[PDB]
Scaffold this active site. Structure first.
Site, PDB file in Angstrom:
ATOM      1  N   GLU A  21      -0.300  -2.916   4.961  1.00  0.00           N
ATOM      2  CA  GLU A  21      -1.453  -2.003   4.952  1.00  0.00           C
ATOM      3  C   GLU A  21      -1.630  -1.272   6.287  1.00  0.00           C
ATOM      4  O   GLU A  21      -1.273  -1.795   7.349  1.00  0.00           O
ATOM      5  CB  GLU A  21      -2.738  -2.775   4.614  1.00  0.00           C
ATOM      6  CG  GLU A  21      -3.182  -2.699   3.156  1.00  0.00           C
ATOM      7  CD  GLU A  21      -3.828  -1.373   2.801  1.00  0.00           C
ATOM      8  OE1 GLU A  21      -4.065  -0.544   3.716  1.00  0.00           O
ATOM      9  OE2 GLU A  21      -4.138  -1.178   1.604  1.00  0.00           O
ATOM     10  N   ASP A  22      -2.192  -0.067   6.204  1.00  0.00           N
ATOM     11  CA  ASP A  22      -2.497   0.760   7.379  1.00  0.00           C
ATOM     12  C   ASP A  22      -4.003   0.871   7.663  1.00  0.00           C
ATOM     13  O   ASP A  22      -4.401   1.492   8.658  1.00  0.00           O
ATOM     14  CB  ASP A  22      -1.932   2.173   7.193  1.00  0.00           C
ATOM     15  CG  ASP A  22      -2.653   2.948   6.113  1.00  0.00           C
ATOM     16  OD1 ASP A  22      -2.919   2.360   5.037  1.00  0.00           O
ATOM     17  OD2 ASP A  22      -2.982   4.137   6.335  1.00  0.00           O
ATOM     18  N   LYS A  70      -9.682  11.706   6.318  1.00  0.00           N
ATOM     19  CA  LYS A  70      -8.835  10.551   6.054  1.00  0.00           C
ATOM     20  C   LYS A  70      -9.691   9.397   5.536  1.00  0.00           C
ATOM     21  O   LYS A  70     -10.635   8.969   6.199  1.00  0.00           O
ATOM     22  CB  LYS A  70      -8.081  10.132   7.318  1.00  0.00           C
ATOM     23  CG  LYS A  70      -7.028   9.062   7.087  1.00  0.00           C
ATOM     24  CD  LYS A  70      -6.182   8.859   8.332  1.00  0.00           C
ATOM     25  CE  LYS A  70      -5.194   7.723   8.164  1.00  0.00           C
ATOM     26  NZ  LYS A  70      -4.413   7.493   9.417  1.00  0.00           N
ATOM     27  N   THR A 115      -0.062  11.235   2.218  1.00  0.00           N
ATOM     28  CA  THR A 115      -0.490  12.268   1.293  1.00  0.00           C
ATOM     29  C   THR A 115      -1.311  13.366   1.999  1.00  0.00           C
ATOM     30  O   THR A 115      -1.670  14.371   1.384  1.00  0.00           O
ATOM     31  CB  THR A 115      -1.366  11.623   0.182  1.00  0.00           C
ATOM     32  OG1 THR A 115      -2.397  10.833   0.791  1.00  0.00           O
ATOM     33  CG2 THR A 115      -0.531  10.709  -0.708  1.00  0.00           C
ATOM     34  N   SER A 141      -2.013   0.312  -4.372  1.00  0.00           N
ATOM     35  CA  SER A 141      -2.534   1.553  -3.808  1.00  0.00           C
ATOM     36  C   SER A 141      -3.796   2.051  -4.522  1.00  0.00           C
ATOM     37  O   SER A 141      -3.948   1.864  -5.740  1.00  0.00           O
ATOM     38  CB  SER A 141      -1.456   2.630  -3.907  1.00  0.00           C
ATOM     39  OG  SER A 141      -1.939   3.890  -3.496  1.00  0.00           O
ATOM     40  N   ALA A 142      -4.680   2.708  -3.765  1.00  0.00           N
ATOM     41  CA  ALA A 142      -5.870   3.353  -4.333  1.00  0.00           C
ATOM     42  C   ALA A 142      -5.518   4.649  -5.053  1.00  0.00           C
ATOM     43  O   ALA A 142      -6.349   5.193  -5.763  1.00  0.00           O
ATOM     44  CB  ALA A 142      -6.899   3.647  -3.254  1.00  0.00           C
ATOM     45  N   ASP A 179       0.857  -1.180   0.000  1.00  0.00           N
ATOM     46  CA  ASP A 179       0.000   0.000   0.000  1.00  0.00           C
ATOM     47  C   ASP A 179       0.902   1.242   0.000  1.00  0.00           C
ATOM     48  O   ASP A 179       2.061   1.171   0.437  1.00  0.00           O
ATOM     49  CB  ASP A 179      -0.902  -0.031   1.231  1.00  0.00           C
ATOM     50  CG  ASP A 179      -1.850   1.134   1.297  1.00  0.00           C
ATOM     51  OD1 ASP A 179      -2.062   1.652   2.416  1.00  0.00           O
ATOM     52  OD2 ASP A 179      -2.374   1.546   0.245  1.00  0.00           O
ATOM     53  N   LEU A 180       0.387   2.379  -0.480  1.00  0.00           N
ATOM     54  CA  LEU A 180       1.159   3.624  -0.520  1.00  0.00           C
ATOM     55  C   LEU A 180       0.865   4.508   0.698  1.00  0.00           C
ATOM     56  O   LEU A 180       1.724   4.703   1.559  1.00  0.00           O
ATOM     57  CB  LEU A 180       0.868   4.397  -1.817  1.00  0.00           C
ATOM     58  CG  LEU A 180       1.621   5.713  -2.026  1.00  0.00           C
ATOM     59  CD1 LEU A 180       3.028   5.451  -2.473  1.00  0.00           C
ATOM     60  CD2 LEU A 180       0.865   6.549  -3.056  1.00  0.00           C
ATOM     61  N   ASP A 181      -0.346   5.051   0.768  1.00  0.00           N
ATOM     62  CA  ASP A 181      -0.689   5.998   1.825  1.00  0.00           C
ATOM     63  C   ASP A 181      -0.737   5.282   3.176  1.00  0.00           C
ATOM     64  O   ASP A 181      -1.447   4.294   3.329  1.00  0.00           O
ATOM     65  CB  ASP A 181      -2.027   6.678   1.526  1.00  0.00           C
ATOM     66  CG  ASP A 181      -2.401   7.706   2.556  1.00  0.00           C
ATOM     67  OD1 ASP A 181      -1.698   8.739   2.661  1.00  0.00           O
ATOM     68  OD2 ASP A 181      -3.415   7.485   3.262  1.00  0.00           O
ATOM     69  N   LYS A 207     -10.860  -1.687  -2.369  1.00  0.00           N
ATOM     70  CA  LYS A 207     -10.713  -2.266  -1.037  1.00  0.00           C
ATOM     71  C   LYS A 207     -11.972  -1.930  -0.227  1.00  0.00           C
ATOM     72  O   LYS A 207     -12.437  -0.794  -0.274  1.00  0.00           O
ATOM     73  CB  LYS A 207      -9.491  -1.679  -0.329  1.00  0.00           C
ATOM     74  CG  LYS A 207      -8.151  -1.889  -1.052  1.00  0.00           C
ATOM     75  CD  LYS A 207      -7.050  -1.017  -0.446  1.00  0.00           C
ATOM     76  CE  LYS A 207      -5.815  -0.940  -1.360  1.00  0.00           C
ATOM     77  NZ  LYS A 207      -4.626  -0.337  -0.676  1.00  0.00           N
TER      78      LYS A 207
END
Ligand code: BEF
Ligand code: MG
Length: 221
Positions: free
Chosen positions: A169-170, A45, A16, A114-115, A8-10, A145
Site C-alpha cells: 500500500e501507498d 489525490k 491513475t 483496490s478502491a 493495492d493498485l493506485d 479503507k
C-alpha cells in the site's frame, strides 16, 4: 512463508493521477473554468469525485443545482473512461512486473485490493490480468479503507487467511486496513505519511520477492 500478496493498485502497480487530471481538465474547459493544472490535481489525490468537482467549481466561485452537479460528476467519469483507454504496459511501476512473475512462478497467490471501480480494465490495459488470481470488488465491501474489509475479501478470494498474506500500500488508510485485516503491511512512501511502525520502501523497485521473503522471516521473530 507467506501464501499470498494483496496488491493495492493506485500508487503501487500504477498511478491513475494523469488520467484523472486529463478528465477534470477536459470538463473544466468544456464548462469554461480556468486553473485546472497539474498542481491543482495533485490536491485531489485521494479526494472523492463529488468533493473534487466542488473544488473545480470553487475555482470560479460557481454554484450549480443538485441535478447539474450530478450530471457534471457523470461527465467527468465519462471523460475518465475515455482517458484510461490510453493506459498501457508503460504505465506499470518499476519492479512490479518482475514481482508478479516471481510470485506466480513460485505458486504464491496474487490478488487486487483496490478502491478503483476500473481495476479489472486497468489490469487488462497494463497486460497484467494473467498474473491475478482474484480481484476484490470494491462495490461489494461494506466499508472502505481504512476498514480492513477489502483486504479480507482479497485474501479469502484466493483461499488464504489474511494472516498468511502480505499487503502492499501507498496510503495511510490502506496500511491501517492491512493491519486490521491481520496481513503484514509493507508500505511504499515515507514514514511521515504512512506511520513509523511498519516496514516501508521508498519506491516500488524495492518490492522484490527476495525482500518480501526477508521481511516475512524477520517479522515472525
Ligand atoms: F488502488 Be488503491 F485503492 F490506491
Ligand atoms: Mg493506493
Amino acid at each position: 512463508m507467506f501464501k499470498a500478496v494483496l496488491f493495492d493498485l493506485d500508487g503501487v502497480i500504477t498511478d491513475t493521477a494523469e488520467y484523472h487530471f486529463r478528465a477534470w481538465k477536459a470538463l473544466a474547459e468544456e464548462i469554461g473554468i480556468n486553473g485546472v493544472d497539474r498542481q491543482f490535481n495533485e490536491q485531489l489525490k485521494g479526494v472523492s469525485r463529488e468533493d473534487s468537482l466542488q473544488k473545480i467549481l470553487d475555482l470560479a466561485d460557481k454554484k450549480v443545482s443538485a441535478e447539474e452537479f450530478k450530471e457534471l460528476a457523470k461527465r467527468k467519469n465519462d471523460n475518465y473512461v475515455k482517458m484510461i483507454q490510453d493506459v498501457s504496459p508503460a504505465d506499470v511501476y518499476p519492479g512490479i512486473l518482475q514481482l508478479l512473475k516471481d510470485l506466480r512462478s513460485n505458486k504464491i497467490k496474487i490478488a487486487l485490493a483496490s478502491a478503483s471501480k476500473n481495476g479489472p480494465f486497468l489490469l487488462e490495459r497494463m497486460n497484467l490480468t494473467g498474473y491475478f488470481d482474484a480481484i476484490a470488488d470494491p462495490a461489494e465491501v461494506a466499508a472502505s479503507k481504512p476498514a480492513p474489509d477489502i483486504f479480507i475479501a482479497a485474501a479469502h478470494a484466493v483461499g488464504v487467511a489474511p494472516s498468511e498474506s502480505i499487503g502492499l500500500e501507498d496510503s495511510q488508510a490502506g496500511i491501517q486496513a492491512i493491519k486490521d485485516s491481520g496481513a503484514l503491511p509493507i508500505g511504499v512512501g515515507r514514514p511521515e505519511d504512512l506511520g513509523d511502525d511498519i516496514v516501508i520502501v521508498p519506491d516500488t523497485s524495492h518490492y522484490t520477492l527476495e525482500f518480501l521473503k526477508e521481511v516475512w522471516l524477520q517479522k515472525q521473530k
